[PDB]
Curated annotation (Swiss-Prot):
Keywords of the record: DNA integration, DNA recombination, DNA-binding, Hydrolase, Transferase, Viral genome excision, Viral genome integration, Virus entry into host cell
Organism: Escherichia phage lambda
Known partners and oligomeric status: Homotetramer. Interacts (via N-terminus) with the excisionase (via C-terminus). Part of the excision complex made of the integrase tetramer, IHF, Fis and Xis.
Signal sequence interval, chain numbering: none
Function: Integrase is necessary for integration of the phage into the host genome by site-specific recombination. In conjunction with excisionase, integrase is also necessary for excision of the prophage from the host genome.
Keyword DNA-binding belongs to the record: yes
UniProt GO molecular function: DNA binding; hydrolase activity; integrase activity; transferase activity
Record's protein name: Integrase
Coiled-coil blocks: none
Gene of this entry: int
Location of the active site: 41, 44, 66, 75
Family, per entry: Belongs to the 'phage' integrase family.
GO biological process: DNA integration; DNA recombination; establishment of integrated proviral latency; provirus excision; symbiont entry into host cell; viral genome integration into host DNA
Keyword Electron transport carried by entry: no
DNA sequence: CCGTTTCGCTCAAGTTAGTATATTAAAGCTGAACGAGAAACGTAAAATGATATAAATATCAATATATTAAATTAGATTTTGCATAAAAAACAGACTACATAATACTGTAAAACACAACATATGCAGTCACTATGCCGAC
């Protein structure tokens, strides 16, 4: 299609539908979280979380389009999901 | 071919993610009104093109010889650029003399208002009428 992410009709797809079809597989996958379950937007958080350990921190700060140095530590939090494993370093 | 149900869409109310400015200071942009000198135009007048023919005047080569305007000097001199310096007049730097304001001090009338006993119109105090439909009563 004309867009990198099109539909089954070779036509663009709204942003308020790409996440909808993502929630279905979420509940169908049979998961279990604390409080409000994740979402499609969380893919941006997981991407940066991996881009911080794979390469560096200065890399997962420009790719996301961020410039400030206040949310670089807030978008790195875990909120109480997986314990921040502290290695020898 | 047509009807029925699911699915792609957008409206409506909650749930999150991101970035952070106000005054000074000094311009810069652009619509609209303001104020002369030179040349292209144009009608009118002056000079010239038009036009031709026998007779009058100029066209010109090739060289001797007297004549002359005038650039080319070459020396003479007013003209022109530039100060130098003193006689002569302007003008601060002094100073007493002279008429004039700010001030020193005496001399005198009178403005400006409290104080006090009366005098009394006038606003305030107290009651009834003027002027005309309410309220209450019938229709």
């Amino acid at each position: 299609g004309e867009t990198i992410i099109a539909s089954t009709r070779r036509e663009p797809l709204s942003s308020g539908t790409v996440s909808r079809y993502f929630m279905r597989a979420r509940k169908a996958s049979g998961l279990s979280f604390e409080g409000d379950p994740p979402t499609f937007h969380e893919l941006r958080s997981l991407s940066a979380r991996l881009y911080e350990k794979q390469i560096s921190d200065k890399f997962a700060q420009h790719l996301l389009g961020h410039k400030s140095d206040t949310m670089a530590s807030q978008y790195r939090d875990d909120r109480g999901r997986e314990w921040d494993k502290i290695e020898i370093k």
